[PDB]
Amino acid sequence: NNKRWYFTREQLENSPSRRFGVDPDKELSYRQQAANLLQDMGQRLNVSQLTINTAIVYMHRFYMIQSFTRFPGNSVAPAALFLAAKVEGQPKKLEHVIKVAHTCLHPQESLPDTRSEAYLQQVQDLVILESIILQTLGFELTIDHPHTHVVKCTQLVRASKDLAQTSYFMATNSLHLTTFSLQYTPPVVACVCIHLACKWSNWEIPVSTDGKHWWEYVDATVTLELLDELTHELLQILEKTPNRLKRIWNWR
Amino acid sequence: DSVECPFCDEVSKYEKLAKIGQGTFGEVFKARHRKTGQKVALKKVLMENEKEGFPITALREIKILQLLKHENVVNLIEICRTKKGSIYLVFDFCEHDLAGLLSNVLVKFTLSEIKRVMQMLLNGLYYIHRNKILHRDMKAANVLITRDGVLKLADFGLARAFSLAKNSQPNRYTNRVVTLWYRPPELLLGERDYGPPIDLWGAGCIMAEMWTRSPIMQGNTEQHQLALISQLCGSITPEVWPNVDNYELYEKLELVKGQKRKVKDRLKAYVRDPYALDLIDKLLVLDPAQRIDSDDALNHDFFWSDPMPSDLKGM
Numbered sequence: 001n002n003k004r005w006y007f008t009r010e011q012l013e014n015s016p017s018r019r020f021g022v023d024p025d026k027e028l029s030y031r032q033q034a035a036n037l038l039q040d041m042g043q044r045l046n047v048s049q050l051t052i053n054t055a056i057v058y059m060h061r062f063y064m065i066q067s068f069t070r071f072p073g074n075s076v077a078p079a080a081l082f083l084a085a086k087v088e089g090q091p092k093k094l095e096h097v098i099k100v101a102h103t104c105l106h107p108q109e110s111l112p113d114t115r116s117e118a119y120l121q122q123v124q125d126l127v128i129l130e131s132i133i134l135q136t137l138g139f140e141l142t143i144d145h146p147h148t149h150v151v152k153c154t155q156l157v158r159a160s161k162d163l164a165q166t167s168y169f170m171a172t173n174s175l176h177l178t179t180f181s182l183q184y185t186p187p188v189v190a191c192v193c194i195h196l197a198c199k200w201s202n203w204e205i206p207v208s209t210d211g212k213h214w215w216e217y218v219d220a221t222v223t224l225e226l227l228d229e230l231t232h233e234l235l236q237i238l239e240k241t242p243n244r245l246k247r248i249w250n251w252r
Numbered sequence: 253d254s255v256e257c258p259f260c261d262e263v264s265k266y267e268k269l270a271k272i273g274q275g276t277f278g279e280v281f282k283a284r285h286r287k288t289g290q291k292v293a294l295k296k297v298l299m300e301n302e303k304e305g306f307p308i309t310a311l312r313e314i315k316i317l318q319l320l321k322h323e324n325v326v327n328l329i330e331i332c333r334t335k336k337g338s339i340y341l342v343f344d345f346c347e348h349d350l351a352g353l354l355s356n357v358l359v360k361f362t363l364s365e366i367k368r369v370m371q372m373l374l375n376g377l378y379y380i381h382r383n384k385i386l387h388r389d390m391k392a393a394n395v396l397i398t399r400d401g402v403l404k405l406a407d408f409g410l411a412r413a414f415s416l417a418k419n420s421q422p423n424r425y426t427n428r429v430v431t432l433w434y435r436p437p438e439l440l441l442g443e444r445d446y447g448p449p450i451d452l453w454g455a456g457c458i459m460a461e462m463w464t465r466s467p468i469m470q471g472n473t474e475q476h477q478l479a480l481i482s483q484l485c486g487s488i489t490p491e492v493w494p495n496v497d498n499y500e501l502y503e504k505l506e507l508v509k510g511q512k513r514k515v516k517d518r519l520k521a522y523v524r525d526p527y528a529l530d531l532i533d534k535l536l537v538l539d540p541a542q543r544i545d546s547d548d549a550l551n552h553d554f555f556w557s558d559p560m561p562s563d564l565k566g567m
């Protein structure tokens with residue numbers, strides 16, 4: 001059912017990777033790396049952030065079933081992006097995704113000869129891994145795109161242009177930097193991102209004309225207590241990520 | 253060694269029985285679950301050449317089947333693998349299709365049964381169109397029926413999603429869709445901004461095929477077809493079909509000039525009920541945006557007259 005790709009704290013603790021020697025902390029960065037590689041390749045291949053996000057989720061879900069010790073993120077990400085792009089209506093050719101993967105991962109080395117057996121096998125390899133990704137995901141590739149949720153919550157609080165841009169930024173970074181999307185529904189994540197965005201922007205969302213808090217209009221299950229914990233975790237990771245907070249930092 | 257695979261079962265859990273995917277396309281097997289005897293259909297994913305990985309059009313089909321969950325739409329149960337490697341789409345099996353029944357002369361439909369068939373068919377079109385999907389391959393062959401008399405639209409291998417076309421940019425959808433005989437005029441004239449109406453036309457050709465037991469407009473090519481259509485619906489003109497001129501292929505395809513609408517008439521001999529005739533007529537309309545839709549088609553007096561739609565047991 002619709003609880004299959006959602007996990008508990010304890011489940012996240014006992015990941016496939018954990019059972020193979022990988023610390024929580026190491027694994028979390030493995031995802032962050034793969035997510036970077038995705039973002040980098042996606043930008044160079046000129047696909048949408050939506051497509052890249054889809055890939056990142058394929059990546060996250062994938063590693064709740066497989067371990068980084070068997071499948072290195074550098075091999076899985078290109079395959080995941082190659083898949084995401086077809087799924088989302090922006091197919092990139094297999095050669096092209098391989099060229100771009102290569103430059104990203106070896107900015108020095110030169111692309112082999114398409115004629116080579118070396119190259120021909122890395123083509124077979126990507127196609128194989130796309131296959132393993134498909135199987136691992138149980139062929140369930142329709143993702144609930146999280147941006148649109150955020151947009152509707154900023155509209156729902158007549159947010160400034162700036163307050164929405166900041167929200168969108170939290171939103172995107174949470175996907176790269178946390179496993180929130182494996183733990184909480186897209187509606188909730190967006191509340192998290194809008195809450196943190198308000199705090200950062202020192203913006204106060206007025207209580208309802210009733211007394212109801214803004215988030216109750218989005219996901220009944222959302223309690224302030226929760227937002228505070230999630231926005232805390234997100235912010236800690238942000239503070240650890242060089243130059244990132246600089247992008248939304250008021251300088252005037 | 254081996255990779256964990258919790259959510260994709262090996263197709264060997266089903267026991268193949270017999271090729272049923274005729275037209276020689278798809279490679280479809282009837283099969284039986286080795287534990288419960290439950291029957292299913294296995295549609296193997298072609299893969300002929302496919303030099304771009306898992307076929308994009310298969311991903312499309314699998315997306316659409318997963319989104320469409322409804323009593324009148326075929327039902328994808330799961331997708332299965334092999335261990336080159338193969339991928340099978342697994343459906344709930346359905347004993348009959350409407351082509352098989354319409355050709356077999358041992359089979360006969362009371363007016364009311366027909367009514368039910370149309371009702372189910374139109375209901376399913378309502379559902380898919382509501383979900384922003386075009387079937388794009390309506391033909392009796394793709395209309396199944398179960399033992400218990402439930403009709404289901406199937407084979408979404410050509411299906412695609414469609415969008416509300418505003419922002420001053422008409423869509424560019426594939427034109428050469430839908431079998432020739434059940435293809436509508438819009439597509440022959442090379443339309444690329446088409447919608448739900450192209451399926452409704454199919455549904456027409458099928459309404460009549462319920463009495464004539466035979467696809468009512470058989471054509472050799474797109475040109476023989478388009479004439480044969482006009483030799484039933486009238487001549488294509490801005491008068492009958494506003495702005496039909498703008499299609500490059502209109503006058504640029506030697507369309508027969510002199511033809512008046514002979515649809516009710518050429519069909520009276522087969523279908524007696526004047527209500528059925530009227531519906532068939534409002535479905536075989538030339539101008540898409542003048543052709544009847546699934547909603548209105550269902551509220552048509554046809555479905556609310558004696559005899560009332562009856563369940564199906566005559567099969």
Ligand SMILES: OC[C@H]1O[C@@H](n2cnc3cc(Cl)c(Cl)cc32)[C@H](O)[C@@H]1O
Nearest residue numbers: 273278280293343344345346393407
């Ligand atoms: O590949 C398209 C052709 O194969 C058969 N077919 C396709 N999907 C199917 C699903 C089921 Cl449950 C059945 Cl019984 C037949 C199917 C249909 O008979 C159709 O004509």
